[PDB]
Each structure stands twice: as structure tokens, then as C-alpha cells.
């Protein structure tokens, strides 16, 4: 890797600088280099990794959706044939997105997940694995589409099983996992009832545990609970 010659601590410091400069591609490259040092990541380092790649892939997804919309409109009735360019460029963005997802999944498989023994780290990584298979599923059309969807579901389900055994219902990682798995059910698995049930049950069980929290933990938990309520409002 081009980051192989840079100190782990310097990669982490530069990822933080890249975040302040809103240079998310750089941030992701620095965090990939840090993961490839082979040591486990701390909680803050896991956040830097996730923020970097979520922003890179989020921009790719937004661009893909714009291009896919144009492509679908170009393929309707009465639409003037514009040639292969819209499809080619949507495919170009799609292949770039798939490459980023494969990179993240590769870091998780080699070897972040297998060394993650505490619930905070293991649930976070398994959630990321579900997330990046979900982004692959958003663009998938081939023989492997169902397997991609099932890979997302399986990673989310393992994360859920650990989170319910090992974390309180207000833990922000448990809440964020449930938020994203609920979105998976709604958008990917064509299971809106499962999406709604999961979001509502997660919200209600968190509400009943807020009394145990400090003011700062309360702020963290209620922030994610509001996202669950926002999605429930969109869907009901």
C-alpha cells in the first residue's frame, strides 16, 4: 500500500486533518493505511474509519442515483435515443462504488472482524459489513444479487444477536445498527413491516432505559432515537 511507509500515529493524525478539511477520499486512504498496520482499532479510530468511507460511498451513491434516474428516463417511451453514454457513465460510477465497498469489506475480513472480541468493536464492524453489502445490493442486478442481499442480512443479524445480549438498549451502536438494519428491511429486502417493527421496538426499548443514563449519554442515545422516529414518520 502507498501508506505502508507512514507511521500508524501519523496516518491517524492525518485522517483527523483530512476530516477537518472535508477531504474524505484522503481520510479513507489514511484510515485504510492505519488498518493495514495490523493492530486493532480504538473506538475513536473505528469512528474515523467509518466516517471516511461513509462519506466517500455516500457521494458515490448520490451520484449513482442521479445517473440512474437519467438513464431510466432515457429508456422510457418517446425518449430520444442518446447513445450508450448515460449507461456507460452510470456503470463507471457504479464500478467505482463497488470497488470502495470491496475495499471496506476486505478490511473487515482481513482482519478486523476476526480480532474483534468486545461487543463495541465486533457489533460496529459487523454493522459496517451489513452496510457495505447493502450498498452493493443497491446496485446489484446479476446472478449474485440474492447472495449479496443475504450477506448483508447475515452480517446485520449477527451484529443484532450480539448487541441484544451484550449492550443496553440505549447503546448508540446498538441503536445505529437497528436503524440501518431497519432501512435494509425497508429498501433492500422489500420487508416494510419488519422495518417498521424493528424501528418501533428499538425506539420503545431505548426510551425505557434512558432513565439510567447521564446527561451526555442521554444526548447520544436520543440523537439516534430521533432518526428512528424520523424513519417511522416517513414510513407510516
Amino acid at each position: 500500500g502507498a501508506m505502508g511507509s507512514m507511521e500508524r500515529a501519523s496516518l491517524i493524525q492525518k485522517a483527523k486533518l483530512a476530516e477537518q478539511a472535508e477531504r474524505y477520499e484522503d481520510m479513507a486512504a489514511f484510515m485504510k493505511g492505519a488498518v493495514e498496520k495490523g493492530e486493532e482499532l480504538s473506538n475513536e479510530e473505528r469512528c474515523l474509519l467509518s466516517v471516511a468511507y461513509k462519506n466517500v460511498v455516500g457521494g458515490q451513491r448520490a451520484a449513482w442515483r442521479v445517473l440512474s434516474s437519467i438513464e431510466q428516463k432515457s429508456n422510457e417511451e418517446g425518449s430520444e435515443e442518446k447513445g450508450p453514454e448515460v449507461r456507460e457513465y452510470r456503470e463507471k460510477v457504479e464500478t467505482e462504488l463497488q470497488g470502495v465497498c470491496d475495499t471496506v469489506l476486505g478490511l473487515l475480513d482481513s482482519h478486523l472482524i476476526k480480532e474483534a472480541g468486545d461487543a463495541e468493536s465486533r457489533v460496529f464492524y459487523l454493522k459496517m459489513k451489513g452496510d457495505y453489502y447493502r450498498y452493493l445490493a443497491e446496485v446489484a442486478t446479476g446472478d449474485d444479487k440474492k447472495r449479496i442481499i443475504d450477506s448483508a442480512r447475515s452480517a446485520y443479524q449477527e451484529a443484532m444477536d450480539i448487541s441484544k445480549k451484550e449492550m443496553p438498549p440505549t447503546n448508540p451502536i446498538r441503536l445505529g445498527l437497528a436503524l440501518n438494519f431497519s432501512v435494509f428491511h425497508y429498501e433492500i429486502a422489500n420487508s416494510p413491516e419488519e422495518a417498521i417493527s424493528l424501528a418501533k421496538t428499538t425506539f420503545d426499548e431505548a426510551m425505557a432505559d434512558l432513565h439510567t443514563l447521564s446527561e451526555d449519554s442521554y444526548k447520544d442515545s436520543t440523537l439516534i432515537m430521533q432518526l428512528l422516529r424520523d424513519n417511522l414518520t416517513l414510513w407510516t
Binding site: 452496510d131 445505529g176 436503524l179 425497508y186 429498501e187 439516534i224 432518526l227 424520523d230 424513519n231 416517513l234
Partner: peptide
């Protein structure tokens, strides 16, 4: 459109 994810 994007429902919320984190």
C-alpha cells in the same frame, strides 16, 4: 431519497 442511516 435517503431514510436516515448512521
Amino acid at each position: 431519497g435517503f431514510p436516515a442511516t448512521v
